[PDB]
Amino acid sequence: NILGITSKKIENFSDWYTQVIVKSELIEYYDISGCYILRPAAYYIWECVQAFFNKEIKKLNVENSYFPLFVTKNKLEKEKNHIEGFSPEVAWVTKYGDSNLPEEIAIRPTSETIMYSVFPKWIRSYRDLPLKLNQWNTVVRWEFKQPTPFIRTREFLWQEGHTAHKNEEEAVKLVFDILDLYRRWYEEYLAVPIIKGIKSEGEKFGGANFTSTAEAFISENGRAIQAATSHYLGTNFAKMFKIEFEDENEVKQYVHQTSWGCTTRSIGIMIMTHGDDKGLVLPPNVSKYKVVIVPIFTDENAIHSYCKDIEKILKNAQINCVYDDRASYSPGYKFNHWELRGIPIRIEVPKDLQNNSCVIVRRDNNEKCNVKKESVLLETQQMLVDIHKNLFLKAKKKLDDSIVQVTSFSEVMNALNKKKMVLAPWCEDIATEEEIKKETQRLSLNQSETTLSGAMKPLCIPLDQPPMPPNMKCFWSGKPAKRWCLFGRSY
Ligand SMILES: O=C(NC1Cc2ccccc2C1)c1nccnc1NC(=O)N1CCC(NC(=O)[C@@H]2CCCN2)CC1
Numbered sequence: 001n002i003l004g005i006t007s008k009k010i011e012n013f014s015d016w017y018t019q020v021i022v023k024s025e026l027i028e029y030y031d032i033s034g035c036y037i038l039r040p041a042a043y044y045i046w047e048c049v050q051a052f053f054n055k056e057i058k059k060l061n062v063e064n065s066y067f068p069l070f071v072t073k074n075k076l077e078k079e080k081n082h083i084e085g086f087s088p089e090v091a092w093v094t095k096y097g098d099s100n101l102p103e104e105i106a107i108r109p110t111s112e113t114i115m116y117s118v119f120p121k122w123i124r125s126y127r128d129l130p131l132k133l134n135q136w137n138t139v140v141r142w143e144f145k146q147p148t149p150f151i152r153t154r155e156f157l158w159q160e161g162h163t164a165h166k167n168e169e170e171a172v173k174l175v176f177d178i179l180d181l182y183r184r185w186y187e188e189y190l191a192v193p194i195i196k197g198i199k200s201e202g203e204k205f206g207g208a209n210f211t212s213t214a215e216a217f218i219s220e221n222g223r224a225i226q227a228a229t230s231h232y233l234g235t236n237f238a239k240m241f242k243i244e245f246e247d248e249n250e251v252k253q254y255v256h257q258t259s260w261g262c263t264t265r266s267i268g269i270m271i272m273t274h275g276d277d278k279g280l281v282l283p284p285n286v287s288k289y290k291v292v293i294v295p296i297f298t299d300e301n302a303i304h305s306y307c308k309d310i311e312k313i314l315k316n317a318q319i320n321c322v323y324d325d326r327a328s329y330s331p332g333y334k335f336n337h338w339e340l341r342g343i344p345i346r347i348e349v350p351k352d353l354q355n356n357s358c359v360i361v362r363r364d365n366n367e368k369c370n371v372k373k374e375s376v377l378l379e380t381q382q383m384l385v386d387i388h389k390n391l392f393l394k395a396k397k398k399l400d401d402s403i404v405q406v407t408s409f410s411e412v413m414n415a416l417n418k419k420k421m422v423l424a425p426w427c428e429d430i431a432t433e434e435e436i437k438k439e440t441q442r443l444s445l446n447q448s449e450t451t452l453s454g455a456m457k458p459l460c461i462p463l464d465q466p467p468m469p470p471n472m473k474c475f476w477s478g479k480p481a482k483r484w485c486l487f488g489r490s491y
């Protein structure tokens with residue numbers, strides 16, 4: 001029992017998340033705060049979604065590349081609105097060994113200024129457009145807020161795409177094309193539902209025209225979290241970096257640029273969504289070992305021979321599996337050993353050999369059933385798909401039951417204290433965002449996230465807008481509201 005999870009997911013969600021990521025061999029802690037080690041089980045998930053996202057962006061003619069880790073002061077402060085948001089979190093290298101550098105250099109929090117410093121040399125005519133680039137790297141944002149593995153780290157793996165188009169229509173089209181790819185990223189591989197929306201003016205990317213987002217929600221602690229982002233930068237970065245091109249009428253024009261990113265935070269959202277009191281729970285598309293086979297003891301040689309036959313037919317069908325034949329541990333140990341590591345299927349094998357069958361157990365609901373030997377391949381093929389849809393449909397229902405539509409403010413704190421979001425009519429005035437955050441944080445006297453702010457913030461203006469009444473006013477200012485917006489506590 002001590003080798004398993006000792007904290008229930010409902011009781012202590014913070015301690016539960018720490019035990020799950022450690023005992024499943026996903027995360028190892030480090031002697032630098034905010035930095036964590038991705039063990040092979042965690043990095044394998046990253047390679048899976050990386051192989052999917054690569055194949056999809058090649059269809060859009062996006063090409064991979066790598067740009068330097070460092071940036072000078074001259075290039076970093078080109079755009080005013082972009083550096084003002086990143087300035088206190090930018091890490092600076094100031095010396096080599098014991099000798100100071102002739103000029104200080106900064107570690108990339110994002111590669112806008114690094115990549116766009118050389119775009120004018122690549123973009124000179126309309127023939128050089130569209131320019132589409134992507135990187136798979138890490139960036140460093142040295143914040144002093146409470147770190148959490150995967151989702152809130154000072155260094156994080158991600159991809160960052162950067163495109164440049166001839167007009168606004170072509171760039172905005174790619175923004176929402178990428179945004180839907182992020183939806184397939186979370187749905188088809190992590191089984192996590194998301195909400196597409198537009199960020200408010202006070203929550204959009206520095207130097208961007210608008211920011212499209214994919215929002216997720218953690219229902220155990222009532223915290224939303226941005227799953228991915230896709231910005232339409234317009235001509236803002238093109239003006240400060242002088243990224244011009246001569247059009248087909250011999251007139252100089254600014255390019256319409258986009259930037260979009262999705263990090264390993266996607267892995268943490270998956271853990272908080274499907275993890276249970278038994279440990280990690282993994283969708284099949286991001287799990288290395290699909291099935292685990294545990295013997296139960298007469299004739300020991302007959303059980304070893306029978307268990308290896310299932311591992312043979314499973315590996316023949318391109319389904320990687322593992323047979324835990326460790327004689328130093330009981331089956332009960334092996335049961336909890338792989339349930340903590342998120343193995344989707346366990347096949348248990350003396351009476352089963354006499355019946356020429358085996359006990360196939362699911363990880364999501366622990367539903368066991370007898371399956372004959374010759375009919376175990378097809379039964380395990382479909383159970384993988386059924387486990388993936390069950391994890392997504394259950395997560396979709398918990399997401400739907402998390403949004404509460406409100407028309408005033410006297411019903412907002414009740415929904416927040418119920419671990420819910422709120423869909424309220426809003427005038428979208430940027431001045432009201434700080435007013436709502438300060439007031440909701442003041443009224444938050446009953447939380448127990450001691451490291452997360454009790455304030456609620458504008459999450460996103462959902463693309464799926466419900467009908468708007470003619471005289472519906474703003475829930476905060478009372479002015480004529482414009483659209484519905486999602487508010488709530490976030491990561
Ligand atoms: O951001 C991260 N770390 C920071 C450093 C640190 C250090 C300690 C504690 C917190 C943080 C925070 C991050 N970390 C691990 C994995 N992924 C990450 N990023 C993302 O998932 N990204 C997509 C959402 C983007 N959100 C915004 O730009 C905000 C939201 C609206 C207004 N602007 C950020 C990029």
Ligand code: PRO
Nearest residue numbers: 110160229259260261
């Ligand atoms: O950090 C961001 O939000 C944008 C998107 C990826 C590159 N820069």
